[PDB]
Design a protein around this ligand. Structure first.
Ligand SMILES: Nc1nc2c(ncn2[C@@H]2O[C@H](COP(=O)(O)OP(=O)(O)NP(=O)(O)O)[C@@H](O)[C@H]2O)c(=O)[nH]1
Ligand code: MET
Ligand SMILES: [Mg+2]
Ligand SMILES: [Mg+2]
Ligand SMILES: [Mg+2]
Lengths: 414, 36
RNA sequence: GCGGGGUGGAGCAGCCUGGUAGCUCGUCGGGCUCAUAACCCGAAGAUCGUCGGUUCAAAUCCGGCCCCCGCUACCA
């Protein structure tokens, strides 16, 4: 029996609809990513998703079929029990630009990036554009290309679009990201796929020095409809530990969390608690270390947490420092063209008073402005920020036909 | 509002009460609206 | 595992309880005002996907086939 551990990795998956993200994570996990009811019936990625798997290699066999996720080695036919490499995490973005913006939340938590490509769709595809350039934003340039639908493409058009792949990477930071043939529904060589996720995407250097912050992505209530008052629980609040480490029964404050009317204006409350338990799914551990979306069940009220109220929450210590500011100064860098769309028009130097969407790592808000400096922006909000230190990645999107697409990547100066 | 009572006469215009109320919805604004 | 309507230009009413597609927005035209719109009334209008069965006799009760297809196995 594998001696249990919590993950070490995050691999957020980006790409458009029909490019093959749902069944590729079905393929690397054994389970799916479309986790809502109207989603269940309609069939489009609506949730910022998540996924987990194990890795055990059989040292005896050839390259590579050893990498399958159970304590056995007869996928490649090896008699041995495999050596363990890690338990893994894949964070699942939407495809549509009618649902693009929100995804940038999870982006602040990827130890890599995955782009899936349509090999039965001409060049260039609409939303993979925006996905890959937002990756270029998040400071995680680690990309995993897959050319998908090797089972409806002719075996030459695949090669032409493969050239187109190596080319699309030329001229962007990802000249040195792979191209491995696997596909979504047909599980074709997902094994050397995980081999490539291991070989090409390395671990980003972990550090336990700054304040341990879990930049949340999900938050839910365990209590089933009709749960008696005796086995009642708090809420689960779920992120991953990038700086530090969190522990069950630990004093913590969550931010922003709860909003309250204090002195006639609008303001929030950073909320103290301790953790009721920690887990990644269905195994028992007690103190979350770096690696993977960890779930932290707390001592709060559950109604505070259901229906993704604090989407992109942050957790740090109730004796710690992360600021909140209604007026935020952000140094912003303009995007070069309309990436994720059919149509790409010029990027205009604007004046203020326009209403733009500013997503703070895993946080998000609207904003307007009065002084529009050349390089930075002084934006007024309705809800304060989650900014653990300098120049954290908050992104700006402007409306395009109801699709809020990127117009710059900004870093928060405080 | 430093009334000027030549306007209520309603001759070739609109009521005054329901214009005051609408000027408030813009003074409250240019005061709040990034007039900081 | 299934399972539903199988309806005029449009809401589909109406299906074990069996003979008049059944009213309603819309298209033609006729009335009232000075003239318009509201308002009034005739007319057009499918005839139940379709092969059947049951049924003196039908959407009405039961089936062949097919239209579109609507619910099939999530809370740290
Ligand atoms: N056999 C096969 N089917 C595929 C492949 N890629 C997509 N499909 C099929 O195409 C349909 C839609 O593609 P989908 O898998 O949803 O791609 P996606 O990029 O994950 N879309 P989304 O993330 O919005 O759900 C599904 O029926 C899916 O099974 C592929 O490589 N092989
Ligand atoms: C809001 S915590 C999300 C992770 C949870 N363990 C699932 O599965
Ligand atoms: Mg999907
Ligand atoms: Mg006077
Ligand atoms: Mg008339």
């Amino acid at each position: 029996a594998w001696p249990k551990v919590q993950p070490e990795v995050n691999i957020g998956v980006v790409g458009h609809v029909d490019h093959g993200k749902t069944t590729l994570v079905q393929a690397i996990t054994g389970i799916w990513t479309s986790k809502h009811s109207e989603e269940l019936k309609r069939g489009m990625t609506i949730k910022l998703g998540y996924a987990e798997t194990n890795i055990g290699v059989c040292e005896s066999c050839k390259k590579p079929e050893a990498y399958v996720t159970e304590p056995s080695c007869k996928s490649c036919g090896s008699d041995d029990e495999p050596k363990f490499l890690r338990r893994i995490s894949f964070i699942d973005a939407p495809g549509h630009e009618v649902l693009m913006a929100t995804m940038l939340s999870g982006a602040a938590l990827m130890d890599g990036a995955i782009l899936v490509v349509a090999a039965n769709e001409p060049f260039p595809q609409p939303q993979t554009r925006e996905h890959f350039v937002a990756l270029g934003i998040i400071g995680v340039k680690n990309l995993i290309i897959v050319q998908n639908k090797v089972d409806v493409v002719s075996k030459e058009e695949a090669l032409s679009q493969y050239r187109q792949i190596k080319q699309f990477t030329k001229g962007t930071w990802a000249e040195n990201v792979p191209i491995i043939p696997v596909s979504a529904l047909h599980k074709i060589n997902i094994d050397s796929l995980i081999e490539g996720i291991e070989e090409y995407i390395k671990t980003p250097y972990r550090d336990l020095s700054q304040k341990p912050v879990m930049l949340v992505i999900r938050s839910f209530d365990v209590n089933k409809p009709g749960t008696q008052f005796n086995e009642l629980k708090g809420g689960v609040i779920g992120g991953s530990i990038i700086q530090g480490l969190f522990k069950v029964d630990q004093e913590i404050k969550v931010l922003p969390g709860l909003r309250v009317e204090k002195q006639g204006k609008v303001s929030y409350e950073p909320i103290f608690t301790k953790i009721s338990s920690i887990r990644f799914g269905d195994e028992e551990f007690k103190e979350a270390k770096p690696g993977g979306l960890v779930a932290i069940g707390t001592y709060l009220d559950p109604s505070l947490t259901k229906a993704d109220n604090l989407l992109g929450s942050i957790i740090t210590l109730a004796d710690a420092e992360v600021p909140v500011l209604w007026n935020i100064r952000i140094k912003y860098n303009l995007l070069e063209r309309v990436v994720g769309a059919k149509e790409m028009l010029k990027v205009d130097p604007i004046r203020a008073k326009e209403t733009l969407m500013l997503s703070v790592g895993s946080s998000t808000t609207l904003g307007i402005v009065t002084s529009v400096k050349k390089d930075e922006i002084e934006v007024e909000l309705r809800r304060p920020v989650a900014v653990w230190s300098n120049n954290i990645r908050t992104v700006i999107s402007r409306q395009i036909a109801g699709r809020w697409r990127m117009i710059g990547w900004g870093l928060v100066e405080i | 509002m430093k009334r000027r009572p030549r306007k209520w006469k309603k001759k070739g215009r609109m009521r005054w009460k329901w214009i005051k109320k609408r000027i408030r919805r813009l003074k409250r604004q240019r005061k709040k609206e990034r007039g900081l």
